[PDB]
Amino acid sequence: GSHMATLKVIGVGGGGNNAVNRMIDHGMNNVEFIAINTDGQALNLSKAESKIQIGEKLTRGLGAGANPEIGKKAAEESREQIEDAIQGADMVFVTSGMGGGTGTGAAPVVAKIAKEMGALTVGVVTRPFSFEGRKRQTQAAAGVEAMKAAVDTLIVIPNDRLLDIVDKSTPMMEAFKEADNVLRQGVQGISDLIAVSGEVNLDFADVKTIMSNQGSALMGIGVSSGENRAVEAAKKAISSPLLETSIVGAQGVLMNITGGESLSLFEAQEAADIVQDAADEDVNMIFGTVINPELQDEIVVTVIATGF
Ligand SMILES: Nc1nc2c(ncn2[C@@H]2O[C@H](COP(=O)(O)OP(=O)(O)O)[C@@H](O)[C@H]2O)c(=O)[nH]1
Ligand SMILES: [Ca+2]
């Protein structure tokens, strides 16, 4: 009697659906993708197997014209279709760009529906670039607050952080792929945790304990080899330049270390200590270990931090 958790990733609005499209291209297994949009033109280009056009009577098939009230009403008008799409989910990631009309207004409705169905509900959203102006930022902030009230856990990516990782020539689409990686690697990290029985095993119940009704979250993965690999991988897992919520102040952590047969007890301690020292709190750790004999010198550290 084993459990196989059903994970769904739901893009809401333009940015959320483009993140979904790029995740589908990258390849993702045992995850169902759902695309939700008012904009029928964009929805027709989605690569997701489940598409939900919301608000057609309201927008005549256009987007929401930057009006979050239209996104919200569109989603409410389509509650039954959204429910049907979520059915069966054990975990739902709702991804959306805040500041426009559809994501800002509809993404919190989608998240609330998922949570009401008992699914562990994680939001992964962007805040707009400052160059998009104060009004867009203020609308986005109201969306972020509505998301907080509707999810178990929330990861916010301020788009301005992308300006910290580009040079003057980095293509915009390349920068967007870096933001996509936050979602994709968090999903993959949970998927991998569920699929393998670890030598010290963590499972979906541990994910639920760390993430259910917690507020802000960090989800990261680090990979390193050679000398100091465990410390370096742990540092990478907790240190993304793109996150509003850093590791500092976390009081709950799920941490998994995967390595080959050379994985040492000492380096597992070193990695665990990096995470708790950076948190600078009494951290309640759920610690796991997977020995993958295919691996030679690589170590992979996965962190989920909550409790801020
Ligand atoms: N990082 C990232 N941000 C995006 C992307 N598309 C849109 N955005 C951001 O998301 C916000 C809302 O845009 P959009 O999702 O198209 O609006 P909506 O469809 O009305 O929800 C914009 O103001 C941008 O800050 C994307 O592909 N990547
Ligand atoms: Ca497992």
* Dist. CA 70 → ligand 1 center (Å): 16
Q: Whose CA is nearest to atom 13 of ligand 1?
A: 100
CA 236, distance to chain mean position in Å, is 17
Burial 68-107 (b: 16+ CB within 10 A, else e): bebbbbbbebbeeebeebbeebbbbbbbbbbbbbbbbbbb
Q: Which two tokens stand for residue 241?
A: 């330049």
How many whole angstroms separate alpha carbon 108 and alpha carbon 68? 11
How many whole angstroms separate alpha carbon 33 and alpha carbon 10? 6
Ligand with an atom nearest the CA of residue 97: 1
64 — alpha (psi -120 to 50), left (phi > 0) or beta?
A: alpha
How many whole angstroms separate alpha carbon 250 and alpha carbon 155? 13
Q: Which two tokens stand for residue 246?
A: 């850093």
The H or E element spanning position 220 is: strand 218-224
Please tell me whether 245 is known to bind a ligand.
Answer: no
How many whole angstroms separate alpha carbon 308 and alpha carbon 231? 23
Q: Give the nearest ligand 1 atom to 103 CA.
A: 21
HSE-CB of 3 using CA atoms within 13 angstroms: 13
Q: Got the DSSP string for 36-64?
A: EES-HHHHHT---SEEEE--HHHHTTS--
Q: Give the nearest ligand 1 atom to 37 CA.
A: 19
Residues lining ligand 1, Cβ inside 6 A: 13-15, 18, 63-64, 97, 99-103, 126, 128-129, 132, 136, 159, 176, 179
118 — alpha (psi -120 to 50), left (phi > 0) or beta?
A: left
* Dist. CA 132 → ligand 1 center (Å): 11
**Helical residues (DSSP H) of the chain, grouped into ranges:** 13-26, 40-44, 56-59, 68-77, 79-86, 102-116, 134-150, 172-195, 204-211, 229-238, 265-279
Check if the beta carbon of residue 78 is closer than 8 Å to that of residue 98.
Answer: no
Residue 67: C-alpha distances to residues 62, 73, 103, 134 (Å):
12, 10, 10, 15
CATH number (domain holding residue 118):
3.40.50.1440
- How was this structure determined? It was done by X-ray
| Residues spanned by the domain of 121 | 7-188
Q: Give the nearest ligand 1 atom to 15 CA.
A: 6
CA-based radius of gyration for the chain: 19
HSE-CB of 119 using CA atoms within 13 angstroms: 29
Amino acid (one-letter) located at 71: G
- Residue 306 makes CB contacts below 8 A (sequence gap 6+) with 153, 210, 211, 214, 215, 216, 217, 218, 250, 251, 252, 253
> If DSSP codes are grouped into helix, strand and coil, which group holds residue 130?
helix
How many whole angstroms separate alpha carbon 199 and alpha carbon 291? 7
Please tell me whether 16 is known to bind a ligand.
Answer: yes
This structure's resolution (angstroms)? 1.2
How many whole angstroms separate alpha carbon 288 and alpha carbon 275? 14
How many whole angstroms separate alpha carbon 147 and alpha carbon 144? 5
Residue 203: C-alpha distances to residues 26, 123, 237, 239, 261 (Å):
25, 20, 19, 24, 22
Q: Which two tokens stand for residue 67?
A: 């009006």
